[PDB]
Amino acid sequence: GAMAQRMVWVDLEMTGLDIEKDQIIEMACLITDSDLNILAEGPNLIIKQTITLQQAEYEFLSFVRQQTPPGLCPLAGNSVHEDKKFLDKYMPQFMKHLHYRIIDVSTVKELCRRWYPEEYEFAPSHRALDAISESIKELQFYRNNIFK
Amino acid sequence: GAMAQRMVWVDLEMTGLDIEKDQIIEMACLITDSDLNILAEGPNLIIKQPDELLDSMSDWCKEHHGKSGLTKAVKESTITLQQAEYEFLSFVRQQTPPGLCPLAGNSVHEDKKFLDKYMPQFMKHLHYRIIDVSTVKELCRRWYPEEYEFAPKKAASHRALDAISESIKELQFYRNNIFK
Ligand SMILES: [Mg+2]
Ligand SMILES: [Zn+2]
């Protein structure tokens, strides 16, 4: 039903894209329903190299366990495939609660750019939680402007 | 811009989902233009991997790769990982400008994880962004539930060339039915 169709939105800041050497500096999480209405805001945590990585994972896993059913909801965000790679490595217990699929807003952007170039031209951060809010607005924009 | 807007479609088959242990056993590549028109079929290679890895695979993996004829084809293969990478890199260098075209497929972020580790030069030819058809699937399921039921079921066994053609058919189905 509607519960399985929720989305687990995240935004992460890393030192870089090298999975073997770079680390997660910042992370935020929030839950939307299938229509992108924000149901609950999770924490915005700055991770050490403020809190430790293992405690941030407990904070985020507790937050999604009380908002989504296990293994059903996908990770959502801007270029969230980059975020998933670091979360599979550094937060594997948090990832055990989610589906393997993602709702990558930048995939939608790559399709908008190609198929609706006029709409792409007029398509619309101090915290990672603010970046999530911006990515939801970008996705809502594609829903209204390029989807049927 | 038209050449930079082409898409590099890939499907991989591996010995499991553990990036620390598992290896690539099959790869296929296909090129479409911006509008999902078929441009060129690339190589379709079965990569030689050890018998220890194959015998120690998951029960899902041993059965599906056994039944499809992939485990047998891997054991008889003379293509190494390095040889397959060279063939795929050569093919995409002939089809797309460097560092501008995205990797495309179903949950292709998982294929990207294996390619970033085992075929880094092939990934360096592609842009940072991906085109994940399973993002569009998940949005179709939610926002266009009627159209979602008309999407064809994936009929292919886990063979790279057939799976990748089905991903193109799926994204073409969404372009045709849920886009404006
Ligand atoms: Mg696949
Ligand atoms: Zn497959």
Strand arrangement within the widest β-sheet of chain A reads 3-2-1-4-5
* Gross geometry of chain A: globular
Give me the number of helical elements of chain A: 6
Distance, first to last CA of chain A: 23 Å
CATH architecture of chain A: 2-Layer Sandwich
What structural category do the secondary elements of chain A indicate?
alpha/beta
Look up the CATH topology of chain A: Nucleotidyltransferase, domain 5
Oligomer: 2 chains of a larger assembly
Strand proportion of chain A = 15-25%
Order of helices and strands of chain A: EEEHEHHEHHH
Number of domains of chain A: 1
**What is the alpha-carbon Rg of chain A in Å?**
15 Å
Q: Give the number of DSSP strands of chain A.
A: 5
Bound molecules: magnesium ion, zinc ion
Helix fraction of chain A, binned, reads 40-55%
Give me the CATH superfamily of chain A: Ribonuclease H-like superfamily/Ribonuclease H
Which CATH class of chain A?
Alpha Beta
Largest sheet of chain A: 5 strands, mixed
Largest interface: A-B, 31 and 31 residues
Mind sketching the topology for me?
The structure holds 2 chains of a larger assembly.
Chain A (H helix, E strand, L loop, with lengths): L6 E8 L9 E9 L5 E9 L6 H13 L9 E3 L2 H11 L1 H5 L5 E3 H11 L1 H5 L6 H19 L2
Helix pairs in contact in A: 4-6
Zinc ion binds next to loops of chain B.
Family (chain A): Belongs to the oligoribonuclease family.
Organism (chain A): Homo sapiens
Cofactor (chain A): Mn(2+); Mg(2+)
